C-alpha cells in the first residue's frame with residue numbers, strides 16, 4: 001500500500017501528510033511530491049514519528065519516483081488556468097507511471113478539474129472511471145459539524161450525505177436523510193446556504209490572509225484512508241465523491257459510493273429526496289454541466 | 301479540560317492544533333492565540349472538523365481571552381535568542397496573571413534556557429509551582445523510538461526509550477540501556493546516540509532552507525499535551541520525560557521520567573541504573589546544561 005501526495009508541501013498537503021503518516025495502516029508507504037524544494041525535508045521531519053509508515057519526499061519537475069508503485073494518488077497541488085494546467089501536468093505523469101492507482105483530485109474547482117483529469121487519462125488510454133474521484137469530503141464533514149451543533153448531537157455520530165457538485169449551488173446536502181434529525185424548511189434553506197458558503201467563513205476569519213487548509217487535510221485524510229481500507233479488501237466502506245457515473249443527472253456527479261478493491265464498487269442511489277432537495281437538484285444541473293464542459297474544453 | 305496553544309499560527313502550532321482538535325477527549329476546549337492576524341481563522345478552519353472539541357482563535361497582544369480558564373498552556377511562539385527569550389517572558393507573564401494554576405509546556409527554543417526564564421517569571425509573579433512547568437522534550441523520545449525500532453526490527457509503536465538531561469546536542473541522553481526487551485552493542489549505542497543528539501540538524505539540512513522540524517514536533521507536543529490532560533482528569537500511570545525543576549542532583553532543571561497526576565508532576569522518577577557510556581555522557585554535559593540554565597536565570601534577573 002503506497003499513497004502519493006502531490007502538492008505535499010502546501011497548507012493542505014502538509015496537514016494531509018501529517019495525518020497519513022500517523023493514521024495509514026501499519027506497513028504502508030507514503031510518498032510526498034511538490035515542486036517546492038523543502039519537500040524532501042518535510043518527509044524527513046515526518047519520518048521521525050514512530051509509526052510503521054515509510055515516508056520519502058521528492059521535488060523537482062519529475063514526479064516519477066514518488067508515483068512509482070502508488071496505489072492512491074491525492075492531488076492537493078495549486079487562477080483557473082493555473083490550477084487547470086497543474087492538474088493536467090500532474091495527471092499526465094500519473095497516467096504514465098501509476099495508471100491503475102485511485103486518483104483523488106483536491107485541486108479546485110473540483111467540478112471542472114476532475115473532468116480535466118478524465119480527459120487526460122482518456123488521451124493516455126488508461127482511463128478507469130471507477131478510479132477517478134473529486135474529493136468533496138470537506139462538504140460532508142462541515143455538514144456533520146453544523147448539524148451536530150444545531151441538534152446537540154455528538155459530532156462524530158452525525159453523517160450527512162452530500163450529492164451534486166463541490167461549488168456553490170451544486171452542493172446539495174441531504175439533510176432529509178440524517179437519522180434522528182429533522183429540520184424545518186427555513187432551517188434547511190439557511191443551513192444549505194451555510195454549507196455552500198462555508199469556505200468564506202475561513203477566508204474572512206483569516207483576515208483575508210488564507211483559506212481552509214487544516215480541515216481539508218482532515219477531510220482528504222478521511223477520504224484517502226477510506227480508499228486504502230477498500231483497496232485492502234475491507235467491506236462496507238462508503239464515501240460520497242464526485243465521479244463519472246451513469247449520467248442520469250450529469251456526466252460527473254457526487255453520490256454515495258461503495259468502495260472496493262478496484263475503486264468504485266457500486267454507485268449507490270441518492271435515495272428519497274425532499275421537495276427542497278428535488279428542486280435544488282433540478283436547479284443546479286445546468287451549472288454542473290457547464291463546469292464539466294469547461295474542463296473538457298481546457299484539455300482541447 | 302481547556303488547552304491553550306500560544307504561537308498557534310506557526311508551523312508547530314497549526315500541526316499541534318490540528319492534532320489536539322482531533323484527539324482531545326470529547327468535552328474539551330481548545331484556544332489558539334498568536335499575534336499573526338490569521339489566527340482566528342485557523343480556529344474557524346479547525347472548527348469545521350466534527351469532533352466534540354470547542355475551538356476559538358485570538359490575535360492582538362492580549363492573550364487573556366485564550367488563557368482564561370486554561371488547564372494546559374503550550375507555548376510554541378517564536379519570531380534570535382533575545383527576541384524569543386522576550387516572547388517567552390511576555391507570554392509566561394500573561395499566564396501567571398490569568399491562569400497561574402495551569403500546566404505550562406514550553407516548546408519555544410532553546411528549551412534548556414527558556415524553561416529557566418519561565419520559572420523566574422513565575423517566581424517573580426508569586427505563583428511558581430515547579431510541578432506544573434515543563435520543557436517539552438518529547439520529540440527526543442519519539443525520535444529515539446523510531447530509530448531504535450528501525451534498527452532492532454521492532455514495531456515502532458511498541459518501543460519506548462527514556463531520554464534524560466537537556467534538549468540540545470550533547471545534553472540529550474537516551475538511556476538505550478533501559479529499553480525493554482532490546483539490547484545494544486557498544487557501536488550501536490554510539491551510532492544511535494549521535495543520531496538522536498543531532499536529529500534536529502538532520503531535519504534542517506534536509507529542509508534545504510525551510511528550517512527546523514514542525515510536523516513531528518506537532519506530534520510530539522500533542523503526545524505530551526494529551527498525557528497532561530489524561531493525568532489532570534485522573535488517569536493513572538501516565539509517564540512522560542520532561543525538563544523540570546527537580547532535586548538538582550545534576551542541574552537545577554533536568555529532564556527525567558515523570559509520573560503525572562491531577563496537580564502536574566506527581567512523582568519525579570529515578571533515572572535508574574546507567575551504563576558506563578550513559579554515565580560518561582551525563583557527566584560530560586553538565587557544565588553545558590548549567591550554563592544554559594544560568595543564561596535564562598540572568599535574562600529575567
Ligand SMILES: NC(=O)C1=CN([C@@H]2O[C@H](COP(=O)(O)OP(=O)(O)OC[C@H]3O[C@@H](n4cnc5c(N)ncnc54)[C@H](O)[C@@H]3O)[C@@H](O)[C@H]2O)CC=C1
Pocket residue numbers: 006007008009010011012013033034035036076077078083086089090105106107108109110135136138139211212213216
Ligand atoms: N477540494 C476542496 O474541498 C478544497 C480544495 N482546495 C484546493 O487545494 C489546493 C491547494 O490549496 P493549499 O494547500 O491551501 O495551497 P498551497 O499554496 O499552500 O499549496 C499548493 C502546493 O501545490 C504545489 N504545487 C504547485 N504546482 C505543483 C506541481 N506542478 N507539482 C507538485 N506540486 C505543485 C505548491 O508548491 C504548493 O506547495 C487549491 O487549489 C485549492 O483550489 C482548497 C480547500 C478546499
Ligand SMILES: NC(=O)C1=CN([C@@H]2O[C@H](COP(=O)(O)OP(=O)(O)OC[C@H]3O[C@@H](n4cnc5c(N)ncnc54)[C@H](O)[C@@H]3O)[C@@H](O)[C@H]2O)CC=C1
Pocket residue numbers: 306307308309310311312313333334335336376377378379384387390391406407408409410411436437439440512513514517
Ligand atoms: N521543543 C522542541 O523540540 C522544538 C522546538 N522548536 C521551537 O518552536 C518554536 C516555534 O517554531 P515554529 O513553529 O517552526 O516557528 P514559526 O515561525 O512557524 O511560528 C512561531 C509563531 O509564534 C508566533 N508568535 C510570535 N510572537 C508571538 C507572541 N508574542 N504571542 C503569540 N505568538 C507569537 C508567530 O506569529 C509565529 O506564528 C522555535 O523556537 C523553534 O526553535 C522547533 C522544533 C523542535
